[PDB]
Structures are given as structure tokens and as C-alpha cells.
Coordinates of C-alpha atoms and ligand atoms in Angstrom, one line a residue:
Chain X
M1006 CA 3.4 -27.1 -10.0
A1007 CA 1.9 -28.6 -6.7
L1008 CA 5.8 -29.6 -6.4
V1009 CA 6.9 -26.2 -6.8
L1010 CA 4.5 -25.1 -4.3
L1011 CA 5.8 -27.5 -1.9
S1012 CA 9.2 -26.4 -2.7
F1013 CA 7.8 -22.7 -1.3
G1014 CA 5.4 -23.8 1.4
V1015 CA 7.2 -26.1 3.8
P1016 CA 10.7 -23.9 4.0
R1017 CA 8.2 -20.9 4.5
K1018 CA 5.9 -22.6 7.6
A1019 CA 9.1 -24.0 8.6
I1020 CA 11.4 -20.6 8.5
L1021 CA 8.3 -18.7 9.8
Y1022 CA 6.7 -21.2 12.4
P1023 CA 9.1 -23.1 14.3
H1024 CA 7.6 -24.0 17.9
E1025 CA 4.8 -26.1 15.9
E1026 CA 3.3 -29.2 17.2
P1027 CA 2.0 -31.6 14.9
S1028 CA -1.4 -30.3 13.5
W1029 CA -3.4 -29.9 10.7
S1030 CA -3.5 -26.8 10.3
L1031 CA -0.2 -27.7 8.9
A1032 CA -1.1 -28.7 5.9
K1033 CA -3.2 -26.4 5.1
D1034 CA -0.7 -23.6 5.6
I1035 CA 2.3 -25.3 3.1
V1036 CA -0.7 -25.0 0.7
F1037 CA -3.2 -22.0 1.2
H1038 CA -0.8 -18.9 0.5
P1039 CA 1.2 -20.3 -1.9
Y1040 CA -1.6 -21.1 -3.6
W1041 CA -3.1 -17.8 -3.7
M1042 CA 0.4 -16.7 -5.6
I1043 CA -0.5 -18.5 -8.5
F1044 CA -3.0 -16.0 -9.2
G1045 CA -1.6 -12.7 -8.2
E1046 CA -1.3 -12.6 -4.8
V1047 CA 1.7 -11.7 -3.5
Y1048 CA 0.2 -11.0 0.6
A1049 CA 2.3 -7.8 -0.2
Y1050 CA 2.0 -6.9 4.1
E1051 CA 3.3 -10.5 4.9
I1052 CA 6.7 -11.1 3.0
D1053 CA 8.6 -9.2 5.2
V1054 CA 7.6 -9.7 8.8
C1055 CA 10.2 -7.3 10.6
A1056 CA 9.2 -4.2 8.8
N1057 CA 7.8 -2.0 10.1
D1058 CA 4.2 -1.9 7.7
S1059 CA 3.9 -5.4 8.5
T1060 CA 0.4 -7.5 9.4
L1061 CA 2.4 -10.3 10.8
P1062 CA 5.3 -9.0 13.3
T1063 CA 5.0 -11.1 15.7
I1064 CA 6.6 -14.1 14.1
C1065 CA 9.5 -12.5 13.5
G1066 CA 12.7 -14.0 14.7
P1067 CA 15.7 -16.0 13.3
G1068 CA 15.7 -16.4 9.8
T1069 CA 12.3 -14.8 9.0
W1070 CA 14.8 -12.6 6.3
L1071 CA 14.8 -15.7 4.0
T1072 CA 11.3 -15.9 3.0
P1073 CA 11.8 -12.9 0.7
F1074 CA 14.0 -14.6 -1.6
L1075 CA 12.2 -17.9 -1.5
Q1076 CA 9.3 -16.1 -2.7
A1077 CA 10.5 -14.4 -5.2
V1078 CA 12.1 -17.2 -6.7
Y1079 CA 8.8 -19.1 -6.5
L1080 CA 6.9 -16.9 -8.0
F1081 CA 9.4 -16.2 -10.7
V1082 CA 9.0 -20.1 -11.2
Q1083 CA 4.9 -20.6 -10.7
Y1084 CA 3.8 -17.1 -12.1
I1085 CA 5.5 -16.7 -15.0
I1086 CA 7.4 -19.9 -16.1
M1087 CA 4.8 -23.0 -14.9
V1088 CA 1.6 -20.9 -15.4
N1089 CA 2.1 -20.1 -18.6
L1090 CA 3.9 -23.4 -20.2
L1091 CA 0.3 -24.5 -18.0
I1092 CA -0.8 -22.2 -21.5
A1093 CA 1.0 -22.9 -23.9
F1094 CA 0.1 -26.4 -23.3
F1095 CA -3.5 -25.3 -23.5
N1096 CA -2.7 -23.0 -26.8
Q1097 CA -1.8 -25.8 -28.3
Chain U
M1006 CA 14.6 -6.8 -16.4
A1007 CA 16.3 -5.7 -13.6
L1008 CA 18.0 -2.7 -14.8
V1009 CA 14.6 -1.5 -15.9
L1010 CA 13.7 -2.4 -11.8
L1011 CA 16.6 0.1 -10.9
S1012 CA 15.6 2.8 -13.4
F1013 CA 12.7 3.0 -11.3
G1014 CA 13.4 2.0 -7.6
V1015 CA 16.3 4.5 -7.4
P1016 CA 14.7 7.4 -8.6
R1017 CA 11.7 7.0 -6.4
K1018 CA 13.7 5.8 -3.0
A1019 CA 15.8 8.7 -3.8
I1020 CA 12.5 11.6 -4.9
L1021 CA 10.2 10.2 -1.8
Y1022 CA 13.1 9.2 1.1
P1023 CA 16.0 12.3 0.6
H1024 CA 16.8 12.6 4.1
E1025 CA 18.4 8.7 4.3
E1026 CA 22.1 8.9 5.6
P1027 CA 23.9 5.3 3.8
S1028 CA 22.8 2.2 5.2
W1029 CA 21.2 -1.4 3.7
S1030 CA 17.6 -1.1 3.8
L1031 CA 18.6 1.5 0.6
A1032 CA 19.7 -2.4 -0.9
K1033 CA 16.2 -3.6 -0.1
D1034 CA 14.5 -0.9 -0.8
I1035 CA 15.1 -0.2 -4.5
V1036 CA 14.6 -4.1 -4.8
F1037 CA 12.1 -5.0 -3.0
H1038 CA 8.5 -2.9 -4.3
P1039 CA 9.8 -2.3 -7.6
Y1040 CA 10.3 -6.5 -7.9
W1041 CA 6.7 -7.4 -6.7
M1042 CA 4.6 -4.9 -9.2
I1043 CA 6.2 -7.4 -11.8
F1044 CA 3.7 -9.6 -10.1
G1045 CA 1.1 -7.0 -10.3
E1046 CA 1.0 -5.7 -6.5
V1047 CA 0.5 -1.8 -7.7
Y1048 CA 0.2 -0.7 -4.1
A1049 CA -2.4 1.5 -5.1
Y1050 CA -2.3 3.4 -1.8
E1051 CA 1.3 3.8 -1.5
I1052 CA 1.9 5.7 -5.2
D1053 CA 0.7 8.7 -4.7
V1054 CA 1.7 10.0 -0.5
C1055 CA -0.2 13.3 -0.2
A1056 CA -3.6 11.4 -1.7
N1057 CA -6.0 11.3 0.9
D1058 CA -6.4 7.6 1.1
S1059 CA -2.8 7.5 1.3
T1060 CA -0.9 5.1 3.5
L1061 CA 2.2 6.8 3.5
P1062 CA 1.5 10.5 4.2
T1063 CA 4.4 11.3 6.0
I1064 CA 7.0 10.8 2.6
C1065 CA 4.5 13.9 1.1
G1066 CA 6.9 16.4 0.2
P1067 CA 8.7 18.3 -3.1
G1068 CA 8.6 15.9 -5.7
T1069 CA 6.8 13.0 -4.8
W1070 CA 4.3 14.2 -7.3
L1071 CA 7.2 12.9 -9.7
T1072 CA 6.2 9.0 -8.7
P1073 CA 3.2 7.6 -10.5
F1074 CA 4.2 9.3 -13.2
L1075 CA 7.4 6.9 -12.8
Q1076 CA 5.8 4.1 -12.0
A1077 CA 3.1 4.5 -14.8
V1078 CA 6.1 4.1 -17.5
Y1079 CA 7.8 1.0 -14.6
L1080 CA 4.8 -1.3 -15.5
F1081 CA 3.7 -0.4 -19.0
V1082 CA 7.5 -1.8 -20.0
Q1083 CA 7.9 -4.3 -17.0
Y1084 CA 4.5 -6.0 -16.7
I1085 CA 3.2 -5.5 -20.4
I1086 CA 6.5 -5.6 -22.4
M1087 CA 9.0 -7.5 -20.1
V1088 CA 6.8 -10.2 -19.0
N1089 CA 5.2 -10.9 -22.8
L1090 CA 9.2 -10.7 -24.0
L1091 CA 10.2 -13.3 -21.9
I1092 CA 6.5 -14.9 -22.2
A1093 CA 6.9 -15.4 -25.7
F1094 CA 10.8 -16.6 -25.6
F1095 CA 9.4 -19.4 -23.3
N1096 CA 7.2 -20.3 -25.6
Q1097 CA 9.4 -21.1 -28.2
Ligands
LIG1101 C1 -6.8 -32.0 -8.5 C2 -6.1 -30.6 -8.1 C3 -4.3 -30.4 -7.3 C4 -4.7 -32.3 -6.3 C5 -5.4 -32.5 -5.5 C6 -4.6 -32.8 -4.2 C7 -4.7 -31.3 -3.6 C8 -4.2 -31.5 -2.5 C9 -5.4 -30.8 -1.1 C10 -5.3 -30.4 -0.3 C11 -5.8 -29.9 0.8 C12 -5.1 -29.1 1.8 C13 -5.5 -30.2 3.0 C14 -6.6 -29.7 3.9 C15 -6.9 -30.4 5.3 C16 -6.6 -29.4 6.2 C17 -7.5 -28.6 6.4 C18 -7.3 -28.0 8.4 O1 -8.1 -29.3 9.3 O2 -7.6 -27.1 8.9 C19 -7.4 -25.2 8.4 C20 -8.8 -26.0 7.8 O3 -9.0 -25.8 6.9 C21 -9.8 -25.3 6.1 O4 -10.9 -24.9 6.4 C22 -10.1 -25.7 4.5 C23 -8.6 -25.4 3.8 C24 -8.2 -26.3 2.9 C25 -7.1 -25.6 1.4 C26 -7.3 -25.9 0.1 C27 -7.3 -24.9 -0.9 C28 -6.6 -24.2 -1.5 C29 -5.4 -24.8 -2.6 C30 -5.2 -26.1 -2.6 C31 -5.0 -26.7 -4.1 C32 -3.7 -26.9 -4.1 C33 -3.7 -27.6 -5.6 C34 -2.3 -28.0 -6.1 C35 -2.1 -27.5 -7.6 C36 -1.1 -27.1 -8.2 C37 -7.5 -25.3 9.6 O5 -6.7 -25.7 10.6 P1 -8.0 -26.4 12.2 O6 -6.7 -27.4 12.4 O7 -8.7 -26.7 11.3 O8 -7.3 -24.8 12.6 C38 -9.0 -25.0 13.4 C39 -8.9 -23.3 14.3 N1 -9.3 -22.4 13.3 C40 -11.0 -22.4 12.8 C41 -9.2 -20.6 13.5 C42 -8.6 -22.2 11.6
LIG1102 C1 20.6 -5.0 -6.4 C2 20.8 -4.5 -5.1 C3 21.0 -5.3 -3.7 C4 22.7 -4.5 -3.8 C5 23.5 -5.0 -4.1 C6 24.8 -5.9 -3.1 C7 24.6 -6.9 -1.9 C8 23.7 -6.3 -1.1 C9 23.9 -6.7 0.3 C10 24.6 -7.5 1.1 C11 24.4 -8.2 2.5 C12 24.6 -7.2 3.4 C13 23.3 -7.1 4.3 C14 22.8 -7.6 5.6 C15 23.8 -7.1 6.8 C16 22.4 -7.6 8.2 C17 21.5 -6.3 8.2 C18 20.2 -7.1 8.7 O1 19.5 -5.8 9.2 O2 20.4 -7.7 8.1 C19 18.5 -8.5 8.1 C20 18.3 -9.2 7.7 O3 19.5 -10.2 6.2 C21 20.5 -10.8 6.7 O4 20.5 -11.0 7.9 C22 21.2 -11.0 5.8 C23 20.9 -10.8 4.6 C24 21.8 -10.5 2.9 C25 21.3 -11.2 1.7 C26 22.0 -10.5 0.4 C27 22.2 -11.8 -0.1 C28 23.2 -11.4 -1.4 C29 22.6 -10.6 -2.4 C30 23.1 -10.4 -3.5 C31 24.3 -9.4 -3.8 C32 25.1 -8.7 -4.9 C33 25.9 -9.2 -5.6 C34 25.6 -10.1 -7.0 C35 24.8 -9.7 -7.5 C36 24.4 -10.8 -9.1 C37 18.1 -8.8 9.7 O5 17.2 -9.2 10.1 P1 16.0 -8.7 9.5 O6 15.6 -9.2 8.5 O7 15.6 -6.9 9.7 O8 14.7 -9.2 10.5 C38 15.1 -10.6 11.4 C39 14.6 -10.5 12.6 N1 15.6 -9.4 13.3 C40 14.9 -8.2 12.8 C41 15.1 -8.8 14.8 C42 16.8 -8.8 13.0
LIG1103 C1 19.6 -14.5 -9.9 C2 18.0 -13.4 -10.4 C3 17.8 -12.6 -10.2 C4 19.9 -11.8 -10.1 C5 20.8 -11.9 -8.9 C6 21.1 -11.1 -8.3 C7 20.0 -10.3 -7.2 C8 20.1 -9.4 -6.2 C9 19.4 -9.6 -4.7 C10 19.5 -8.0 -4.3 C11 19.7 -8.1 -2.7 C12 18.7 -6.9 -2.3 C13 19.5 -6.7 -0.8 C14 19.4 -7.1 0.3 C15 19.6 -6.5 1.7 C16 19.8 -5.5 2.3 C17 18.9 -5.8 3.3 C18 19.0 -5.9 4.9 O1 20.1 -5.5 5.4 O2 17.8 -5.3 5.3 C19 17.1 -5.4 5.4 C20 16.3 -7.2 5.7 O3 16.3 -7.7 4.2 C21 15.3 -9.0 4.2 O4 14.4 -9.0 5.0 C22 15.2 -9.7 3.1 C23 15.1 -8.8 1.8 C24 15.3 -9.3 0.5 C25 14.1 -8.6 -0.6 C26 14.8 -9.9 -1.8 C27 13.5 -10.0 -3.0 C28 13.2 -8.8 -3.6 C29 13.6 -9.0 -5.1 C30 14.9 -9.1 -5.1 C31 15.3 -9.6 -6.7 C32 15.1 -8.9 -7.7 C33 16.2 -8.8 -8.8 C34 16.0 -8.5 -10.2 C35 15.6 -9.9 -10.9 C36 14.4 -8.8 -12.2 C37 16.2 -4.2 6.0 O5 16.9 -3.3 6.2 P1 17.6 -3.1 7.4 O6 18.8 -2.3 7.5 O7 18.6 -4.8 7.6 O8 16.6 -2.9 8.4 C38 16.3 -3.3 9.6 C39 15.1 -3.1 10.4 N1 13.8 -3.4 10.7 C40 13.6 -4.8 11.3 C41 12.5 -2.8 10.8 C42 13.7 -3.7 9.2
LIG1104 C1 -5.3 13.4 -20.1 C2 -5.5 13.5 -18.6 C3 -4.7 14.9 -17.9 C4 -6.0 16.2 -18.9 C5 -4.7 16.6 -19.8 C6 -3.9 18.0 -19.5 C7 -3.3 17.8 -19.3 C8 -3.6 18.5 -17.3 C9 -2.5 18.8 -16.2 C10 -1.9 20.2 -16.5 C11 -0.9 20.8 -16.1 C12 -1.1 21.5 -14.3 C13 -1.7 20.9 -13.1 C14 -0.9 20.7 -11.7 C15 -1.1 22.3 -11.0 C16 -0.5 22.3 -9.4 C17 -1.1 21.6 -9.0 C18 -0.6 20.6 -7.8 O1 -1.2 20.9 -6.5 O2 0.1 19.6 -8.5 C19 0.7 18.5 -7.9 C20 1.5 17.5 -8.8 O3 1.1 18.4 -10.1 C21 2.4 19.1 -10.2 O4 3.2 19.6 -9.1 C22 3.0 19.4 -11.1 C23 2.2 18.3 -12.5 C24 2.6 18.5 -13.9 C25 1.7 16.9 -14.5 C26 1.4 17.3 -16.5 C27 2.2 16.8 -17.4 C28 2.3 17.0 -18.2 C29 0.3 16.3 -18.6 C30 0.1 15.6 -20.3 C31 -0.6 17.4 -20.5 C32 -1.6 17.2 -21.5 C33 -1.5 16.7 -23.0 C34 -0.8 15.9 -23.7 C35 -1.3 14.2 -24.1 C36 0.1 13.8 -24.8 C37 1.4 19.4 -6.5 O5 1.5 18.4 -5.2 P1 1.1 16.7 -5.3 O6 1.3 16.6 -5.8 O7 -0.9 17.3 -4.2 O8 1.7 16.6 -3.6 C38 2.8 17.7 -3.7 C39 3.3 17.5 -2.4 N1 2.3 18.9 -1.5 C40 0.7 18.2 -1.3 C41 2.5 19.7 -0.3 C42 1.9 20.5 -2.8
LIG1105 C1 26.6 -10.6 6.2 C2 26.2 -11.0 4.9 C3 26.8 -11.4 3.6 C4 27.7 -11.3 2.6 C5 25.7 -11.7 1.7 C6 25.8 -13.1 1.2 C7 26.6 -14.4 1.8 C8 25.3 -15.3 1.9 C9 25.3 -15.9 3.1 C10 24.5 -15.4 4.6 C11 24.1 -14.4 4.9 C12 24.8 -13.5 6.2 C13 24.2 -14.1 7.0 C14 24.0 -13.8 8.2 C15 22.7 -13.1 9.4 C16 22.1 -12.2 10.1 C17 20.8 -11.7 10.7 C18 20.7 -12.7 11.7 O1 21.7 -12.9 12.5 O2 19.8 -13.7 11.7 C19 19.3 -14.5 13.1 C20 20.5 -15.8 12.3 O3 20.6 -16.4 11.2 C21 21.1 -17.2 10.9 O4 21.4 -17.5 11.7 C22 21.3 -17.7 9.4 C23 22.3 -18.8 8.6 C24 22.6 -18.7 7.5 C25 21.5 -19.6 6.7 C26 21.9 -20.3 5.3 C27 22.4 -19.4 4.9 C28 22.7 -20.1 3.2 C29 22.5 -19.5 1.9 C30 22.8 -20.1 0.7 C31 23.1 -19.4 -0.4 C32 22.9 -19.6 -1.6 C33 22.4 -18.3 -2.7 C34 21.9 -17.8 -3.9 C35 21.9 -19.0 -4.8 C36 22.1 -18.2 -6.4 C37 19.3 -14.4 13.9 O5 19.4 -13.1 14.0 P1 17.7 -12.5 14.0 O6 17.3 -12.1 12.4 O7 17.7 -10.8 14.8 O8 16.7 -13.1 14.8 C38 16.5 -12.9 16.3 C39 17.3 -13.1 17.1 N1 17.5 -13.6 18.0 C40 17.3 -15.0 18.5 C41 18.1 -13.1 19.7 C42 15.6 -13.0 19.0
LIG1106 C1 2.7 24.1 -13.1 C2 2.8 23.2 -14.6 C3 2.6 23.6 -15.8 C4 2.4 22.4 -16.6 C5 3.5 21.6 -16.2 C6 4.1 20.4 -17.6 C7 5.1 20.6 -18.8 C8 6.4 19.6 -17.2 C9 7.1 20.7 -17.1 C10 6.9 21.0 -15.2 C11 6.3 20.5 -14.4 C12 5.7 21.4 -13.7 C13 6.0 21.0 -12.1 C14 5.0 22.1 -10.9 C15 5.4 21.6 -9.5 C16 4.5 22.5 -8.6 C17 4.5 21.7 -7.3 C18 5.8 22.1 -6.1 O1 6.3 23.1 -6.3 O2 6.5 20.6 -5.6 C19 7.6 21.1 -5.4 C20 8.9 21.6 -6.0 O3 8.8 20.7 -7.3 C21 9.8 21.3 -8.1 O4 11.0 21.9 -7.8 C22 10.0 20.7 -9.6 C23 11.1 21.0 -10.3 C24 10.5 20.2 -12.0 C25 11.5 18.7 -12.1 C26 11.9 18.4 -13.5 C27 10.5 18.3 -14.1 C28 11.6 17.3 -15.5 C29 10.2 16.8 -16.5 C30 10.9 16.4 -17.7 C31 10.0 16.9 -19.0 C32 9.4 15.2 -19.3 C33 8.0 14.8 -19.7 C34 7.5 13.5 -20.3 C35 8.3 12.9 -21.7 C36 7.5 12.5 -22.7 C37 7.6 22.1 -4.3 O5 6.2 21.6 -3.5 P1 5.6 20.8 -2.7 O6 5.1 20.0 -4.5 O7 4.1 21.5 -2.3 O8 6.6 20.5 -1.7 C38 6.7 20.4 -0.3 C39 7.0 22.3 -0.4 N1 7.2 23.0 0.8 C40 8.9 22.4 0.8 C41 7.5 24.0 1.4 C42 7.1 22.2 2.3
LIG1107 C1 5.8 -36.4 -1.8 C2 5.0 -35.3 -0.8 C3 6.5 -35.0 0.3 C4 4.8 -33.9 1.1 C5 3.9 -34.4 1.6 O1 3.5 -35.5 0.8 C6 3.5 -36.0 0.0 O2 4.3 -35.1 2.9 C7 3.0 -35.6 3.8 C8 3.1 -36.3 4.8 C9 2.3 -34.6 5.3 C10 2.1 -35.0 6.9 C11 2.0 -36.0 7.9 C12 1.7 -36.4 9.1 C13 1.0 -35.2 10.0 C14 0.3 -35.2 11.7 C15 -0.4 -34.6 11.6 O3 -1.0 -34.6 13.2 C16 -1.7 -34.9 13.8 C17 -3.0 -34.1 13.7 C18 -3.4 -34.0 15.5 C19 -3.8 -32.6 15.4 O4 -3.8 -31.7 16.7 C20 -3.8 -34.7 16.0 O5 -5.2 -34.5 16.9 C21 -1.3 -34.1 11.0 C22 -0.4 -33.5 9.9 C23 0.9 -33.8 9.3 C24 1.9 -33.3 9.6 C25 1.6 -34.2 7.6 C26 1.1 -33.0 7.0 C27 1.2 -33.1 5.5 C28 2.3 -34.1 5.2 C29 3.7 -33.4 4.8 C30 2.1 -34.5 3.4 C31 3.0 -33.5 2.3 C32 1.9 -32.9 1.0
LIG1108 C1 25.5 -1.4 -12.2 C2 24.5 -1.7 -11.2 C3 24.4 0.4 -10.3 C4 23.4 0.3 -9.7 C5 24.1 -1.0 -8.3 O1 24.8 -2.3 -8.6 C6 25.0 -2.2 -10.1 O2 25.0 0.0 -7.8 C7 25.4 -0.6 -5.9 C8 26.5 0.3 -5.1 C9 25.4 -0.4 -4.3 C10 25.9 0.8 -2.9 C11 27.3 0.9 -2.3 C12 27.1 1.1 -0.8 C13 26.7 1.2 -0.3 C14 27.0 1.8 1.0 C15 26.4 0.8 2.1 O3 26.4 1.3 3.5 C16 26.7 0.7 5.5 C17 25.5 0.3 5.8 C18 25.7 1.2 7.1 C19 24.5 0.9 8.0 O4 24.2 1.6 8.8 C20 27.3 0.4 7.8 O5 27.5 0.2 9.4 C21 24.8 0.5 1.8 C22 24.8 0.4 0.8 C23 25.0 0.8 -0.2 C24 24.8 2.3 -0.3 C25 25.1 0.4 -1.6 C26 23.2 -0.1 -1.7 C27 23.2 -0.8 -3.6 C28 23.9 0.1 -4.5 C29 23.5 0.7 -5.2 C30 24.2 -1.1 -5.7 C31 23.6 -0.9 -7.1 C32 22.4 -2.2 -7.5
LIG1109 CA1 -2.8 -9.4 -10.3

């Protein structure tokens, strides 16, 4: 689950924030939102950052259209496969 | 699941956006919100677009009152039946 998380969190932060010097925030921002997705928070108005109803209209730029596709795959794997695999373990 | 999705996404976009020329957005807007519903995002302030607490007060018009009924059926089928059918598969 933590691997699937970084599989998603690192490409997202890299696509959306491409002018980042090294910082401790980079360690927070690759775990924070991907973790709250596990609990069904999809951050609906932040997925497409070039949409008109975006809450993040300023990080629109090249490649950012990739992040919906990424998150669609992430949640299917994380929210459906991996959480219910853990539940299946707990059921046993 | 993708069929149930378009069963809902196409009537919604057609009822709510009736003056649309052909566009690539039509391909996004028939998949985008119906997919995030699968993960429990109901877009609560967008369902009834003629309600006072609406975030979409401008797409109010004829037929738009049909879209709550549509989405009520969609999520029951998608969120409850189809996701837990997939989970039941995964459990086996
Ligand atoms: C045993 C269970 C798991 C394994 C254990 C190991 C887990 C690994 C743990 C990793 C921790 C992540 C690194 C933290 C360090 C960076 C924070 C920091 O310094 O800066 C940030 C602050 O940070 C905070 O205020 C705290 C944020 C912590 C979030 C942890 C919970 C999220 C889920 C995590 C769980 C995932 C587990 C995955 C499981 C599926 C902000 O940056 P800044 O530079 O301070 O900015 C200052 C300016 N400002 C005030 C405007 C902000
Ligand atoms: C099912 C429902 C879908 C319909 C199906 C048919 C596919 C339809 C697809 C057709 C592809 C053509 C559409 C893109 C043309 C450019 C338009 C555009 O603005 O793009 C935008 C992004 O997107 C891109 O730049 C490219 C997106 C490609 C995604 C399609 C992958 C294949 C989908 C499955 C293939 C189907 C068959 C296989 C299925 C098993 C440009 O950018 P932006 O995001 O606006 O923001 C960035 C910054 N900006 C604003 C400054 C620019
Ligand atoms: C293998 C598993 C699935 C089967 C495979 C096939 C999957 C089918 C995939 C279909 C892809 C849909 C077509 C997208 C391309 C058209 C959009 C476009 O060109 O422009 C849009 C950009 O688009 C984006 O920024 C990305 C949007 C992609 C959303 C994908 C995630 C949702 C779930 C998908 C998965 C659900 C699948 C169902 C599963 C239950 C914006 O519109 P525009 O006109 O560019 O507007 C420009 C102006 N603006 C800047 C203000 C915006
Ligand atoms: C169970 C709890 C419910 C009570 C039960 C009894 C049913 C009560 C129902 C009674 C029906 C009469 C009410 C509507 C009258 C018009 C009023 C109106 O403004 O309508 C609005 C919507 O709605 C419609 O336009 C029609 C809605 C019909 C829905 C009923 C389906 C059957 C439900 C089950 C039947 C029950 C028994 C079977 C059960 C197995 C029109 O306007 P708007 O949506 O605001 O926006 C549009 C644009 N505008 C603002 C510019 C106008
Ligand atoms: C045309 C669709 C073709 C048909 C669709 C199907 C083909 C799919 C292929 C491609 C989809 C189409 C890509 C075109 C993007 C157009 C927008 C663009 O230029 O965005 C940006 C560049 O974007 C790039 O340079 C993207 C480069 C490709 C990335 C690699 C994709 C690999 C997919 C892996 C495949 C695995 C698939 C899944 C496996 C199961 C720049 O423009 P902007 O966004 O406006 O940014 C602001 C620009 N500014 C700096 C001037 C301010
Ligand atoms: C009164 C009802 C009594 C009982 C109803 C209950 C019985 C059901 C029957 C009917 C529901 C009642 C509809 C009333 C609509 C009133 C509002 C209206 O006119 O809206 C609009 C038109 O709306 C239409 O023209 C709708 C036409 C019916 C669509 C087909 C329904 C099929 C239901 C399938 C059944 C399957 C059931 C489920 C199967 C298990 C116009 O008004 P507006 O919204 O203000 O728009 C702005 C107008 N403007 C352009 C001037 C600015
Ligand atoms: C197998 C796994 C692959 C992924 C991973 O684990 C192992 O690999 C680790 C490497 C880590 C980075 C190493 C160095 C730094 C530099 C630091 O810069 C100083 C700050 C500055 C403040 O301004 C001083 O003044 C910022 C943090 C950063 C980028 C780490 C982030 C987390 C990373 C990416 C970790 C990640 C979870
Ligand atoms: C069995 C399944 C039934 C549903 C479905 O799959 C098969 O049937 C497909 C047919 C597709 C449309 C075909 C043609 C176009 C024209 C294009 O217009 C150019 C843009 C313009 C920009 O301004 C050029 O300049 C916009 C897209 C659109 C409407 C398609 C949308 C997706 C649709 C509805 C697909 C949908 C998922
Ligand atoms: Ca939820």
C-alpha cells in the first residue's frame, strides 16, 4: 500500500510542481493527499487543475492533464483492490 | 461498470448541457464525475442545480430535475452493487 502510494504521489508532485528546490515539503506532499484518498477523499476540485471549477488554477501547465489518469488508476488499485485485500485478511 | 457509467454520464451531460457543439470535452464530461462517484464523491452541491445552495445555478433549465433521480439509481447500482460484486470476486 505504501509502494502504490509513492507510485502515485511522486509522479503527481513531479508533474504538478516542476520548479521545486529540495525541501522537507517534498516528503510531506508525496504522502499526504495519496493517504487521504485511501479513505475516500478524492479532492474533487483539485484533480484537473486547468478546469474552470479548479481550486488550483495556478499549477496548470504542461503535463498536468496526466494526473487524472494517474489518480484513476491509483484509487482503483488503492481504494478497491488493496483496502479490500487487507479487509479480506482481517476477515480471516 | 464502464457501461453503467455511460448509461448515467451521457444522459446527465445531455440533460444539463443542451447547447453543446461537438468538442473533446464531451468525452471527458461523460466519464469524469461518474468515475469519482464510484469512490463516494456524490458532488453534493451540484446534483440539484436549481437549488438555492447550488454551485451550478446557471445550468438550471428544462429537464434538469431528472438528474437527481438518475444519480440515485446510478450510485445504488455502481457504488453498492457493482463495487461489491467486484469485491466479492476479489474475495474469492
Ligand atoms: C507504520 C505505518 C506506515 C509506515 C511508517 C512510516 C510512514 C512514513 C511517514 C512519513 C511522514 C512524511 C514526512 C514528514 C516530514 C515532512 C513534513 C515537513 O517537515 O514539512 C511539512 C509539515 O509537515 C507536517 O506538518 C506534518 C505532515 C505529516 C503527514 C503525515 C500523515 C500523512 C500520512 C502518512 C502515512 C503514510 C503511511 C503509508 C501506509 C499506507 C510542510 O513543509 P515545511 O517545509 O514544514 O513547510 C513549512 C511552511 N508551512 C507552514 C506553510 C507548511
Ligand atoms: C470513453 C470516453 C472517451 C471517448 C473515447 C475516445 C477517446 C477520446 C480521446 C481522444 C484524444 C484527443 C483529445 C485530446 C486533444 C487535445 C485537447 C485538449 O485540450 O487536451 C488537453 C489535455 O489532453 C491532452 O493533451 C491529451 C489527452 C489524451 C487522452 C486520451 C487517451 C486515450 C483515451 C482512450 C481512447 C479510446 C479508445 C480505447 C478505450 C478502451 C490539453 O490540456 P488541458 O488538459 O486542457 O490542460 C493543460 C494546460 N492547458 C490548459 C494550457 C492546455
Ligand atoms: C482500463 C480501464 C478502463 C477502460 C479503458 C478505457 C478508459 C476510457 C478513457 C477515457 C478518457 C476520456 C477522454 C479524455 C480526453 C478528452 C478530454 C480532452 O481532450 O480535454 C480535457 C482534458 O482532459 C484532461 O485533462 C484529462 C481528463 C481525463 C479523465 C480520465 C479519468 C476519469 C476516469 C476515466 C476512466 C473510466 C473508465 C471506466 C472504468 C470503470 C479538457 O477538455 P478540453 O476540451 O480540452 O477543454 C479545454 C479547456 N479547459 C482548459 C478549460 C479544460
Ligand atoms: C417518498 C417521498 C416523496 C413523497 C411521495 C409522493 C410523491 C411526491 C411527488 C409528487 C409529484 C408532484 C411534484 C412536482 C410538481 C411540480 C413542482 C416542481 O417545481 O417540480 C420541479 C421538479 O419536479 C418536477 O418537475 C416533477 C417531479 C416529479 C417527481 C415524482 C416522481 C414519483 C416519485 C414517487 C411517487 C410516490 C409513490 C410511489 C413510491 C413507490 C420543477 O422545478 P425544479 O426541479 O425546481 O427545477 C427546474 C427548473 N425551474 C426551477 C426553472 C422550474
Ligand atoms: C492527440 C491525442 C492522440 C490520441 C490519444 C491516444 C495516444 C496517447 C498519446 C498521447 C496523448 C496526446 C499528448 C498530446 C498533448 C497535447 C497538449 C500539450 O501539448 O500539453 C503539454 C505538452 O505535453 C506533452 O509534451 C506530452 C508528451 C507525451 C507524454 C507521454 C505520454 C505517454 C502515454 C503512455 C501510454 C499508455 C496508455 C495507457 C496504457 C494502458 C504542453 O501544452 P499545455 O498542456 O498547453 O501546457 C502549457 C504550454 N505552455 C508551456 C506553452 C504554456
Ligand atoms: C406534475 C407531475 C405529477 C406526477 C409526476 C409523476 C409521474 C411521472 C410523469 C411525469 C413527471 C412530471 C413532469 C413535470 C415537469 C414539470 C416541470 C417542467 O415543465 O419542466 C420543464 C419541462 O419538463 C418536461 O417537459 C418533462 C417532460 C417529461 C419527461 C419524461 C418523463 C418520463 C418518466 C419515466 C417514468 C419512469 C418512472 C420510474 C420507473 C420506475 C420545463 O420547466 P422548467 O423546469 O421550469 O424549465 C425552464 C422552462 N423555460 C424554458 C420556460 C425557462
Ligand atoms: C525506496 C524508497 C524510494 C522513495 C523514498 O524512500 C525510499 O526515497 C527517499 C529519498 C528521499 C529524499 C532524500 C533527500 C531529500 C533532500 C531534502 O532536502 C533538504 C531540505 C532543505 C529544506 O529547505 C534543507 O535546508 C528534502 C527531502 C528529500 C527530497 C527526500 C524526500 C523523501 C525521499 C524522496 C524518500 C522516499 C520516501
Ligand atoms: C459503444 C460505446 C458507446 C459510447 C461511445 O463509445 C462506444 O461512443 C463513442 C463515440 C464518441 C464521439 C464520437 C465523435 C466525437 C466528435 C468529436 O468532435 C471533434 C472535436 C472538435 C473540437 O472542437 C474538433 O475541432 C468530439 C468527441 C465525440 C463527440 C465523441 C465523444 C465520445 C463518444 C460519444 C464515444 C463513447 C464513449
Ligand atoms: Ca466516502
